[PDB]
């Protein structure tokens, strides 16, 4: 019924400007205005202002006010944010969301978010690498294994074991940031009868750089 | 502006019992709060507004109250899926403005951690590159302190530690704890041991390695 998807994520360096889009499908666009709301990182969720859908009319939170500028594509269903003279702690996750009434006080359903990253590093592919056990059973005919994907830049990546057909006993960290680039792993723990017996494989796509990789973790023990 | 206020921030109780969230504003704001809930790594869904006043869809467990200042969620039957940011929110008089949030942990009961050291790649000591990876899976309470330890010496320099966030379908959390190295300073020793302490134990898990065959 009512789904908001948004622009996919993206990374512009200081100075810039970039322009969200949130394409709203269910409602009748025109009766239902739009709440722009900013989680910040750490911060926690802060109204950035709302935009009547029918006149065409922004609010702006004050904290907003400036380099801030809400529009719409009316016609096609989509409101947008734009930031123009990006700073660099613009960086964030932006959400649209439905006003159930005027000024938006209520948001009832909300989009997936766009996440800005504000950063002059360069992007930077990946490094994936096998990481099978030196053996130790790891819990009872149990083998754990990984993947370690090194040193890309922005985030996100995409880490599937074997096309996502295994999915028990996955653990996937959450990327850290070194300085300039990102470190992530995942475990993967399988019988003793699933490998290396059966072919496990860790499929990363890091779509910044257009690398997708398939690491077959080989029994090397 | 109405500020709204939520304190604690973080909060426990096992499946099946209540917990009570506890928002406040700064002056009356005549019931009217809306409470979400943002699922980890989800956006906000819409809970309850005017205090008390149920989404479509939400089951009746989740109830709130509250009056004047004071304003409360509770939840009964604490699924493990509860797991969550609670946020209150004021929409009496512009601008909406939102409390910090409240986390929702689950507790369970104490698990080992499954520990798991892995020796560098191959192909990424080709890149000049030594990392040695350790998982600790599926552990509970969260507190686990990892020390690395290169022939002995408490490696604590060049260590990168990662975790989950408790998990929703078994209550548990996992680490990884990354000690990337030099090639030259990994072909320098030779014992290398990823040592954790946690509740579960009077005696440090150690894993350690130095590689054969299994």
């Known amino acids: 019924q009512i789904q908001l998807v948004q622009s996919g994520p993206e990374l512009k360096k200081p100075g810039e400007t970039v322009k969200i889009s949130c394409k709203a499908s269910?409602?009748?666009?025109?009766?239902?205005?739009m709440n722009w709301v900013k989680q910040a990182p750490g911060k926690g969720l802060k109204w950035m202002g709302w935009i009547n859908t029918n006149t065409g009319e922004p609010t702006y939170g004050e904290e907003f006010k400036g380099r801030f500028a809400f529009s719409l594509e009316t016609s096609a269903s989509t409101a947008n944010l734009q930031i123009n003279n990006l700073k660099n702690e613009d960086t964030a996750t932006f959400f649209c969301?439905?006003?159930?009434?005027?000024?938006?006080?209520?948001?009832?359903?909300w989009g997936q978010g766009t996440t800005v990253t504000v950063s002059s590093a360069k992007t930077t592919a990946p490094s994936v690498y096998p990481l099978a056990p030196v053996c130790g059973d790891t819990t009872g005919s149990s083998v754990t294994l990984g993947c370690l994907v090194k040193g890309y830049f922005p985030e996100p990546v995409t880490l599937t074991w074997n096309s996502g057909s295994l999915s028990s006993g996955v653990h996937t960290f959450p990327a850290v940031l070194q300085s300039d680039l990102y470190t992530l792993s995942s475990s993967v723990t399988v019988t003793s009868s699933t490998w290396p017996s059966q072919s496990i494989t860790c499929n990363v796509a890091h779509p910044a750089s257009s690398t997708k990789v398939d690491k077959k973790i080989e029994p090397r023990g | 502006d109405i500020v709204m206020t939520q304190s604690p921030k973080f909060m426990s109780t096992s499946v099946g019992d209540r917990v009570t969230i506890t928002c406040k504003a700064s002056?009356?704001?005549?019931?009217?709060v809306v409470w979400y809930q943002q699922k980890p790594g989800q956006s906000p869904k819409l809970l309850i507004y005017?205090?008390?006043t149920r989404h479509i869809g939400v089951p009746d467990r989740f109830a709130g109250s509250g009056s004047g200042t004071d304003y409360t969620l509770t939840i009964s039957s604490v699924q493990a899926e509860d797991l969550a940011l609670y946020y209150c929110?004021?929409?009496?008089?512009?601008?909406?403005?939102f409390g910090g949030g409240t986390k929702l942990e689950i507790k369970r009961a104490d698990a080992a951690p499954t520990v798991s050291i892995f020796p560098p790649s191959s192909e990424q000591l080709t890149s000049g590159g030594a990392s040695v990876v350790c998982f600790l899976n599926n552990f509970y309470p969260k507190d686990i302190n990892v020390k690395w330890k290169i022939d002995g010496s408490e490696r604590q320099n060049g260590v990168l530690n990662s975790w989950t966030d408790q998990d929703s379908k078994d209550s548990t959390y996992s680490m990884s704890s990354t000690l990337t190295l030099t090639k030259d300073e990994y072909e320098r020793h030779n014992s290398y041991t990823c040592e954790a302490t946690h509740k579960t134990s009077t005696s440090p898990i150690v894993k350690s390695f130095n590689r054969n065959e299994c």
């Open positions: 929110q004021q929409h009496y008089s512009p601008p909406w403005t």
């Open positions: 269910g409602y009748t666009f025109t009766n239902y205005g």
């Open positions: 005017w205090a008390s």
């Open positions: 969301a439905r006003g159930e009434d005027n000024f938006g006080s209520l948001s009832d359903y």
């Open positions: 002056q009356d704001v005549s019931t009217a």
